[PDB]
Nucleic acid binder design. Structure first.
Ligand SMILES: C[S@@+](CC[C@H](N)C(=O)[O-])C[C@H]1O[C@@H](n2cnc3c(N)ncnc32)[C@H](O)[C@@H]1O
Ligand SMILES: C[S@@+](CC[C@H](N)C(=O)[O-])C[C@H]1O[C@@H](n2cnc3c(N)ncnc32)[C@H](O)[C@@H]1O
Lengths: 529, 464, 529
DNA sequence: GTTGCACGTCGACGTTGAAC
DNA sequence: GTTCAACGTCGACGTGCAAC
């Protein structure tokens, strides 16, 4: 997506919505509906698309409450009808606008609007793109609260990139939201396919209708997602209304949802929106996020794969969280964990991570237990530049992680520890089991692996793993290899050095490395004794 | 070899095993009046530990409330820790002299068994950075921005013999006292400086003084307003959209830069094209600087002075305001005058915090009252003031190293206090052996060699 | 106007609204409409009140979108009809609720609700009161933004108290909002009247219909206000729908509004809601608040009186603000100004004041200029306890101000400076023109008066008058009267004292007041020389 | 050239009570 | 009894550009 002049133009319109009573979160939804009707008229074909009596002119001509009421009426009429194509967009649609004066102003304003962000031919796509971008701004905005849906663009790109969705594969998004992941996935497939040109017609139909699926609780959000896909040319299933279905993941809808080869999603954090957990799970839990995880495991086909953005919350949480986690490692093969930096999301405080795992194992797709042997972790979070408007989070930041990650989507590719990006070396190291019996160089590396048994024993089955410490200090770096190996040891060894310096002054020894080594040989040994 | 190099004498044990009881506390129903009403027993919150040792209790918690609440009564001479409020992981500790008290969820009481472990010993132990490093291993934590009591119990710490623990703790306590002493002198010096500020500006060196509009002043001095002496300018900002402006080569100094201090250069700068079209004001060196937005602590002012060789010059944003001295004035002298609190008092009285706030009007600055001393006198005064500030800086440095010293000692003591050798005194018939600075060291060396030799008899001596 | 168990009960219902898409600000509006319908049914008389086909059962029975759509339809139907009584409540009414699931839940929830906060007989009043109280909470809440309307309860009480509205007098509120002031004013009148029993029937009708008037821009807000008055038994004008009219003060409606004897209002701060200033004024200004002030001056009858809450912005602001300010003093007699403390309003940062003035003068009600001779100011703001949930702002704080204020509504009562409440003495005095040539005792006083000429000259016609500092310091207090008189002088005189102490030590003089005076006699004189 | 904010936006320290 | 937070509470430090 991209936006510029048009988004600014769109932004101005939102002012009416703001004054209207519409929330920031619902600006896009409000705008999208009106634009759709407007565009239909612009097509000239609108008779085909819209029913008679309910069209742009009908709405446009009206004013005041009379107009507002008409708008409501129009929304209801559109939402319900055999013409599911249009009806899906309109399904469960309603306007938040209370102030009648605002509606009149808004309709007229956009009515006069140009194709200003356009291109040769109608740039329907531009509007949708601009629409998403504007939505992104709202998502970014803290006040709106829209941000819950918000996900970093580069994050999505990377996730799909690693997954490498192929054609004929079904991609699912339990928390579709705007359908950010689905669109990206589709884009990825097309980029490979030459826009599906490479594929046969049958496969092409599959990708268009069947390939991607999503579910959204909020009807308002669903509308936006539907429009997004529509411009994206993702028709989906007409019966359902399109690619994104309206329903509760946690409820009956979720179970009804079809199984999928690949799953990429960012579930909501916190208690979440009104979503009752009517559905039973292996381990029942109040944790909404945990509930999603169980769902993801269930839907995946044997040997399926998925990446899930999760709050840090899931990693250690005791009680059922421990049980579920254990369940995850047993049923799935959790190969990689990515620790995200902070400031990336609309919400500031939240710590987030990305989990990578496979359903069962490649060798044994139907392996119930002991799937997860080793886990790799990447510490993107500590000692990182503060992100913000000033410091944007970009694709470049992610690139090092992806490299170590390996081309294999399963994560099977060869891997070795030893990543020192973002001034990894400079960063301080923590003392513990994590960096226990660890060499100096390794301790600094962002990329490290851990054994299942270790996690079980030391971690006590806690995913919250990290070696590094967030600081900033300067100290001369002359130490023995064994000294560096033990983080804890450093304090004791260092003390010895202080005394040595005093003696050296009296001696008047020159400042040379060799001299230091000679002294260290005797002094160092003494400490060992 | 274990958590760290550990001596023969010591063993590594978890706090849980060593500690008799570790538990949290909880919070009562605030809504009910009865719980709080007329209560004997003290209640503690997180803030309590932070403020000094825990002698006093901010809130009061009734036992009726106690029965209903999970909160429990803690014993005296008990160590306490705070779950929340840290650099993600660290943790806090405290001791309670006052009779048994209660707390809430964040706090976790811990009781040491009699003679098993000292409260003092543990307190310092936790304080150690090594302790912090160990914890940092968990990380910021995923879903936890606190310290879980369960995790607390897991912690492993080395244990000294009872005798040494007392001796070791004693040594550390003493250092702590020393740092405080330096702090006291530090505070006093600004007080002295403050007096000079008031006396010098108003009093001046003279001896004959007369009544003046602005307080009693010397006879020689003369009075004038700011506008007379200097000129005020206002300034505007460019439009971010145009990238052309983005090219630069010429400095722009924002308030943030002002916060930094003396300002030769600025983080951001604007292009000449910008100055032409924008018609920004250019500034020469030696010019005065003032802060129009932010305010400061409410309605107050800030100042600064520009520097330049023939080579460079500076321009600033709207937020900053500039003043130029016509012919006669000493920029440094004036700058100090503005910062003086006397000015602050005059200014604040004239305008209390009002809607126009966190900023100063041009009118206010111009109307400002000022004295005009002679050029020579002005220079003399300025030199004196600047000099005093330097002294304050030096003392601060002294404190820092002292802190470093503690760090070094603690590290050594951790390993060594941990060896049995520490409990035992060095073998010596006479106390004189230790008395000499050199002699004591020599005695230590001899003892070490002899002890090792004797130890040689059995591997177990060294081995265990 | 209190709430307790019921408000908590109502609060729970709001949860549906929250999840529904309704804003915090619009919780009350949503609840109020439903409750009204419900109550009508409870009456059993509903056939009289509501039209057939549109009633509680009709709405109650429906579910889902079908229900939601019914609700919108019902709202429209009610709002428009000859039956203005009901129609006024419903006028420009609309529901913010997007989520169909929420509506069903909400209707059913309240449907099952009890008279729980009630009394012998239907406690319709209780619901309204609880309603306002709940509204107050929202007003208090920062997130809602409802707080813009919010005003301190004790503040309103005091304002009406000072005004002392009488019967047959017309009270107006340009920014009626919930009609907090109007209800208070009505209450005040009734308290005097024995609930209007004392008054004759004609007068009684006057009070009910004619006595109070208000105007509200937002239809949503107006609805709430209307309901408030309704429970309050303030019928107002049926043509208009009731006491509170719907319209723009700044627009044609404002001018159309009738003249009033008394005006008490708290206009909105900031740019305000969408309110275009279609109306011309003596001094046209972008300042919304300034615009209101001009309106108030205009509507007032000669010899009228009013109190207005205003931000500090108005006092100091130059440009047109100076012109308007001057205009105010010329046309009106501005006797008193009250400086409010902070933390009282929903918004933290805002600084507010209360202006008291009369239209023209009592002696000459039609006096165009030079009306305002002297102005009294009360510094309630500085050196005050931080208010908050923990530290509530109560009536007691206000009592000292009212006492000095004087019983006379015009403010004519005798007045003298000299108020030292809230540790006024302890407060730090600052050095400036206001405390110029002021004695020590007077400087500390919160209650002080200023001349018009002084304001003109020193202040340069700026209302922002302030004598005190906010600090906290301890110093021995031994000073000469003239020393204290000059705030600026203090620094110089104090310096002399420092040296004196040193000499005293050598002398070994005892610590006695007389000794200090003797030394001061010589030392003090020297400084004067 | 320059003025104004029921301000607009950004670090420090610890939740507290509903839930089980 | 006690556990947990796309955190809750207390500030800290300054708008910046549309408007005239
Ligand atoms: C962080 S957003 C997903 C953003 C998405 N990755 C994107 O590209 O925009 C999480 C979404 O989960 C949805 N959600 C919350 N609870 C749900 C539930 N029980 N069932 C289905 N979706 C739910 C929310 O409405 C929200 O849109
Ligand atoms: C602070 S509130 C008044 C609160 C009132 N004192 C009470 O008791 O609740 C200010 C009110 O002014 C209204 N308002 C804003 N602009 C207006 C305009 N142009 N005309 C009429 N009312 C307006 C707002 O909608 C708001 O309710």
């Amino acid at each position: 997506m991209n936006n510029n002049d048009l988004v600014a133009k769109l932004w101005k319109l939102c002012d009416n919505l703001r004054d209207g009573g519409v929330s920031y979160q619902n600006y896009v939804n409000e705008l999208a509906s009106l634009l759709f009707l407007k565009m239909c008229k612009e097509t000239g074909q609108e008779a085909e698309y819209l029913p008679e009596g309910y069209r742009w002119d009908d709405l446009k001509s009206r004013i005041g409450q009379e107009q507002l009421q008409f708008y409501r009426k129009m929304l209801v009429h559109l939402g319900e009808d055999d013409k599911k194509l249009v009806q899906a967009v309109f399904h469960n649609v309603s306007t938040t606008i209370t102030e009648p004066k605002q509606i009149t102003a808004l309709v007229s304003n956009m009515d006069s609007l140009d194709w200003y962000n356009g291109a040769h031919g109608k740039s329907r796509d531009d509007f949708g793109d601009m629409y998403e971008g504007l939505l992104q701004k709202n998502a970014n905005e803290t006040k709106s609260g829209a941000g819950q849906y918000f996900t970093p663009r580069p994050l999505i790109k990377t996730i799909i990139h690693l997954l490498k969705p192929q054609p004929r594969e079904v991609v699912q998004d339990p928390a579709a939201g705007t359908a950010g992941f689905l669109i990206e996935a589709d884009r990825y497939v097309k980029s490979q396919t030459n826009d599906l040109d490479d594929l046969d017609g049958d496969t092409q139909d599959f990708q268009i209708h069947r390939a991607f699926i999503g579910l959204e609780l909020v009807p308002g959000t669903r509308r936006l997602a539907l429009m997004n896909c529509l411009l994206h040319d993702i028709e989906g299933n007409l019966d359902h209304g399109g690619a994104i279905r309206l329903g509760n993941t946690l409820g009956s809808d979720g179970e009804n949802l079809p199984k999928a080869h690949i799953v990429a999603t960012n579930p909501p954090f916190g208690s979440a929106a009104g979503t009752n957990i009517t559905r039973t799970f292996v381990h029942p839990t109040s944790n909404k996020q945990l509930c999603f995880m169980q769902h993801i495991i269930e839907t995946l086909h044997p040997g399926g794969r998925a990446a899930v953005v999760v709050p840090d919350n899931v990693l250690f949480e005791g009680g059922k969280g421990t049980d579920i986690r254990r369940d995850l490692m047993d049923k799935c093969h959790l190969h990689t964990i990515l620790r995200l930096p902070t400031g990336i999301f609309y919400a500031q405080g939240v710590k987030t991570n990305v989990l990578f795992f496979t359903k069962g194992t490649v060798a044994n797709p139907n392996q119930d237990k002991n799937c997860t042997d080793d886990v790799w972790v990447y510490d993107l979070r500590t000692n990182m530049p503060s992100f913000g408007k000033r410091t944007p989070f970009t694709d470049e930041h992610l690139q090092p992680f992806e490299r170590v990650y390996g081309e294999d989507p399963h994560g099977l590719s060869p891997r070795t520890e030893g990543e020192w990006s973002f001034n990894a070396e400079e960063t301080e190291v923590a003392d513990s089991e994590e960096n226990k019996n660890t060499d100096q160089h390794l301790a600094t590396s962002r990329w490290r692996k851990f054994s299942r048994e270790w996690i079980r024993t030391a971690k006590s089955d806690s995913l919250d793993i990290s070696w590094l410490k967030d600081k900033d200090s300067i100290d001369a770096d002359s130490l023995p290899e064994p000294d560096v190996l033990a983080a804890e040891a450093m304090g004791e060894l260092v003390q010895a050095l202080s005394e040595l310096d005093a003696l050296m002054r009296e001696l008047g020894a020159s400042d040379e490395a060799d001299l230091q080594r000679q002294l260290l040989e005797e002094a160092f040994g003494g400490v060992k004794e | 070899m274990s958590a760290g190099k550990l001596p023969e004498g010591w063993v590594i044990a978890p706090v849980s095993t060593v500690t008799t009881l570790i538990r949290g506390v909880t919070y009562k129903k605030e809504q009910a009046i009865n719980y709080l009403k007329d209560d004997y027993l003290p209640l503690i919150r997180a803030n309590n530990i932070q403020n000094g040792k825990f002698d006093t209790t901010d809130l009061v918690f009734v036992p009726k409330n106690l029965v209903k609440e999970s909160q429990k009564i803690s014993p005296e001479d008990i160590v306490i820790a705070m779950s929340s409020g840290s650099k993600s992981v660290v943790g806090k500790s405290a001791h309670q002299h006052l009779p048994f008290e209660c707390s809430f969820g964040a706090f976790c009481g811990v009781l040491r068994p009699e003679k098993l472990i000292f409260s003092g010993f543990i307190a310092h132990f936790t304080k150690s950075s090594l302790y912090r490093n160990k914890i940092s291993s968990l990380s910021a934590g995923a879903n936890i921005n606190n310290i879980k009591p369960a995790s607390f119990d897991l912690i492993n710490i080395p244990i000294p013999p009872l005798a040494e623990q007392k001796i070791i703790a004693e040594k550390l306590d003493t250092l702590l006292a020393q740092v405080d002493s330096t702090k006291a002198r530090f505070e006093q010096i600004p007080q002295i400086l403050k007096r000079f500020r008031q006396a010098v500006l108003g009093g001046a060196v003279n001896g004959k003084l007369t009544e003046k509009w602005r307080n009693f002043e010397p006879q020689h001095s003369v009075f004038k307003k700011l506008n007379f002496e200097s000129i005020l300018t206002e300034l505007r900002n460019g439009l971010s959209s145009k990238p052309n402006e983005s090219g630069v080569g010429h400095p722009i100094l924002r308030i943030s830069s002002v916060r930094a201090g003396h300002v030769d250069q600025n983080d951001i700068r604007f292009l000449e094209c910008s100055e032409s079209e924008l018609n920004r004001h250019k500034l020469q060196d030696g010019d005065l600087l003032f802060t129009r937005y932010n305010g400061s602590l409410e309605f107050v002012g800030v100042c600064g002075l520009l520097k330049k060789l023939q080579h460079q010059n500076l321009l600033y944003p709207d937020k900053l305001i500039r003043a130029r001295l016509t012919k006669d004035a000493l920029p440094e002298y004036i700058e100090i005058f503005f910062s003086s609190p006397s000015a602050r008092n005059a200014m604040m009285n004239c305008v209390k915090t009002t809607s126009g706030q966190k900023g100063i009007s041009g009118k206010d600055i111009k109307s400002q009252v000022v004295l005009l001393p002679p050029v020579k006198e002005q220079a003399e005064i300025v030199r004196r003031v600047e000099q005093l500030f330097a002294y304050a800086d030096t003392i601060e440095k002294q404190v820092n190293n002292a802190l470093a010293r503690v760090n070094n000692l603690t590290q050594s003591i951790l390993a060594k206090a941990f060896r049995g050798e520490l409990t035992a005194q060095w073998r010596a018939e006479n106390p004189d052996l230790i008395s000499g600075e050199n002699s004591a060291a020599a005695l230590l060396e001899k003892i070490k060699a002899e002890r090792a030799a004797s130890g040689g008899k059995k591997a177990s001596r060294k081995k265990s």
